[PDB]
Amino acid sequence: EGREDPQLLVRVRGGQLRGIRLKAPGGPVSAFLGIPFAEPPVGSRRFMPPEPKRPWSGVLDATTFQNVCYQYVDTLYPGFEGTEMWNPNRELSEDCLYLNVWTPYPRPASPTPVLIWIYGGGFYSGAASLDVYDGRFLAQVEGAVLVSMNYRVGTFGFLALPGSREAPGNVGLLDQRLALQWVQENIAAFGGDPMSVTLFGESAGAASVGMHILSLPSRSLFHRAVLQSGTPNGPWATVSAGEARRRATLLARLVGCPGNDTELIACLRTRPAQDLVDHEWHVLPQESIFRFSFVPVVDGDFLSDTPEALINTGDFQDLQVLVGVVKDEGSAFLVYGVPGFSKDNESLISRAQFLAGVRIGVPQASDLAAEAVVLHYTDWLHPEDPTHLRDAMSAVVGDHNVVCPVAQLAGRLAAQGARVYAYIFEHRASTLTWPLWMGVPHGYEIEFIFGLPLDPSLNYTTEERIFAQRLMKYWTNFARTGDPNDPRDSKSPQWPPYTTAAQQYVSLNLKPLEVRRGLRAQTCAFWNRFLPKLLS
Numbered sequence: 001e002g003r004e005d006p007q008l009l010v011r012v013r014g015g016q017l018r019g020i021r022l023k024a025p026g027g028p029v030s031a032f033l034g035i036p037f038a039e040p041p042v043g044s045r046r047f048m049p050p051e052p053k054r055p056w057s058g059v060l061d062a063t064t065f066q067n068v069c070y071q072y073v074d075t076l077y078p079g080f081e082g083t084e085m086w087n088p089n090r091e092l093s094e095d096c097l098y099l100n101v102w103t104p105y106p107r108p109a110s111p112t113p114v115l116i117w118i119y120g121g122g123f124y125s126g127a128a129s130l131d132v133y134d135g136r137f138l139a140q141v142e143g144a145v146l147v148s149m150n151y152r153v154g155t156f157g158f159l160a161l162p163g164s165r166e167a168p169g170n171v172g173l174l175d176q177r178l179a180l181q182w183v184q185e186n187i188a189a190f191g192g193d194p195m196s197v198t199l200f201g202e203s204a205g206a207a208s209v210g211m212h213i214l215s216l217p218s219r220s221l222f223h224r225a226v227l228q229s230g231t232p233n234g235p236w237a238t239v240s241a242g243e244a245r246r247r248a249t250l251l252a253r254l255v256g257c258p259g260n261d262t263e264l265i266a267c268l269r270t271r272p273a274q275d276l277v278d279h280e281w282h283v284l285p286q287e288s289i290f291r292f293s294f295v296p297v298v299d300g301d302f303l304s305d306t307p308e309a310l311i312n313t314g315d316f317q318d319l320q321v322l323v324g325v326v327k328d329e330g331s332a333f334l335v336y337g338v339p340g341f342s343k344d345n346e347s348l349i350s351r352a353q354f355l356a357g358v359r360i361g362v363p364q365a366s367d368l369a370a371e372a373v374v375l376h377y378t379d380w381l382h383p384e385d386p387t388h389l390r391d392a393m394s395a396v397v398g399d400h401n402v403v404c405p406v407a408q409l410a411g412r413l414a415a416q417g418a419r420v421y422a423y424i425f426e427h428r429a430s431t432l433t434w435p436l437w438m439g440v441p442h443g444y445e446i447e448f449i450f451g452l453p454l455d456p457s458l459n460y461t462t463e464e465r466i467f468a469q470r471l472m473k474y475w476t477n478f479a480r481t482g483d484p485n486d487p488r489d490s491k492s493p494q495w496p497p498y499t500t501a502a503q504q505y506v507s508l509n510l511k512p513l514e515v516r517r518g519l520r521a522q523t524c525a526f527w528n529r530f531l532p533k534l535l536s
């Protein structure tokens with residue numbers, strides 16, 4: 001003070017922040033970027049739960065994105081937008097526990113509903129600073145307060161020797177919880193309403209939102225939840241205590257760390273961060289798709305039991321959730337090492353490649369279980385047809401990992417109190433750089449929900465701009481009221497709740513909302529009711 005914009009000075013519990021007035025297409029928004037919310041988790045704090053940020057003096061500059069959490073950089077297709085857009089856009093550091101706030105400009109006069117975004121990336125990658133998570137459009141067009149946080153990924157976030165003090169597990173989830181606490185204490189300073197906080201997230205972000213729903217301390221920190229293309233139940237989002245111990249111990253051996261828990265973790269704490277990242281992928285029990293080395297653990301603490309036990313016995317009377325999937329959940333995963341598949345050709349595969357693909361996609365399956373999958377997905381009229389085999393391989397991955405875990409989740413919640421709305425997102429961005437065969441891949445509804453197409457410089461179609469406006473309106477209506485439908489609007493077709501009785505959900509595309517029934521019901525009976533029994 002006291003030259004300098006007076007609408008950009010805010011005090012939080014830790015001291016003064018100076019934000020930055022950014023431009024959105026329709027007008028200005030306030031951004032407070034790189035606010036630290038924890039003591040840097042470095043040195044003797046690696047693998048430890050986060051400690052709250054100690055207060056500072058002077059004005060903290062909150063005008064730029066801060067460091068991204070240490071992680072593996074994707075180099076499948078170097079220079080290719082389709083992969084590069086998910087890669088870190090700030091330097092990598094273990095000092096990375098910072099969050100971001102976008103608010104209208106000037107800041108809202110009455111308490112506004114808050115959306116908190118939790119990025120995905122297999123629990124090994126992601127950053128809140130990526131272009132596709134820019135909160136400026138929701139802030140400007142919908143008047144939302146939007147917050148997003150960095151949380152520790154990979155080993156730093158999730159390496160666990162369960163039972164130990166030095167490496168308890170789930171610390172990445174604990175980072176996210178600390179940011180939720182920081183929102184409760186501080187968000188009013190920005191004109192947000194701590195009594196109206198909605199969590200939303202996609203992929204591992206979605207599974208995280210889910211874990212917060214199933215964890216007691218978290219439940220008093222938010223009111224409503226959105227889970228896009230991910231769930232806490234299912235094959236990849238968690239691991240048993242035993243399995244996490246196994247993986248931690250193997251990684252320790254692989255980097256030279258040999259023999260009780262204190263010694264082992266102390267040695268790990270002296271290894272360069274990059275060394276851990278360089279070995280991260282070597283601890284998986286089988287060759288596999290849609291599996292990640294270091295993920296939330298079932299510790300009997302953050303997670304008192306498996307997500308499955310918790311969804312089946314929890315009381316969800318007070319909860320409102322929006323859940324959904326994209327048309328082609330599996331397709332992107334196939335180019336990460338499934339033989340026969342690529343972004344540069346049509347990936348027309350053979351029957352042999354489809355069976356080999358299934359062993360990889362369902363790694364936990366016996367010979368019998370795998371034959372069951374293959375038989376179920378074969379087109380018996382054209383069983384050698386390479387186009388169908390390619391689409392089948394895709395659907396096997398997508399159904400087993402996302403669609404059917406989502407279906408089970410929606411079903412259990414609705415059955416046990418929750419108001420649940422469900423969607424399938426079916427529009428392929430006209431600006432998409434992946435080939436057509438991949439359809440609508442994992443992650444490609446995000447840029448629409450966040451309103452990117454409203455940026456004229458981005459080259460989306462006019463109808464796409466209107467489409468993003470609809471979606472932003474649904475997401476923010478849901479944040480505001482627990483119901484995505486416009487209360488005043490009469491002309492627009494209604495989005496009904498999902499129920500066990502009727503199993504209704506909506507198509508999200510360029511055409512007006514169509515109500516559909518049964519979310520791959522038949523096939524999800526195979527994956528959710530039959531396959532588990534067969535694995536015995």
Ligand SMILES: Nc1ccc2c(c1)c(-c1ccccc1)[n+](CCCCCCc1cnnn1CCNc1c3c(nc4ccccc14)CCCC3)c1cc(N)ccc21
Nearest residue numbers: 072074086120121122203288289290291332336337442443
């Ligand atoms: N060159 C290879 C070949 C085989 C394997 C390799 C790499 C990698 C890999 C390791 C380090 C860095 C990058 C990749 N992974 C690790 C996981 C790979 C999963 C890739 C897809 C994904 C899913 N969630 N996060 N990501 C990482 C990339 N970020 C994306 C994200 C999203 N969507 C997409 C869609 C298309 C391409 C990328 C992508 C949406 C959410 C967030 C991230 C595999 C994992 C396996 N279980 C098997 C094979 C391979």
Ligand SMILES: *[C@@H]1O[C@H](CO[C@@H]2O[C@@H](C)[C@@H](O)[C@@H](O)[C@@H]2O)[C@@H](O)[C@H](O)[C@H]1NC(C)=O
Nearest residue numbers: 338339340341342343344345346347348349
């Ligand atoms: C499609 O591509 C897969 C990956 O191979 C890569 O791309 C092709 C176009 C070649 O130029 C190759 O040298 C690259 O490494 C192949 O494994 C697969 O066999 C291909 N399938 C068909 C049907 O052509």
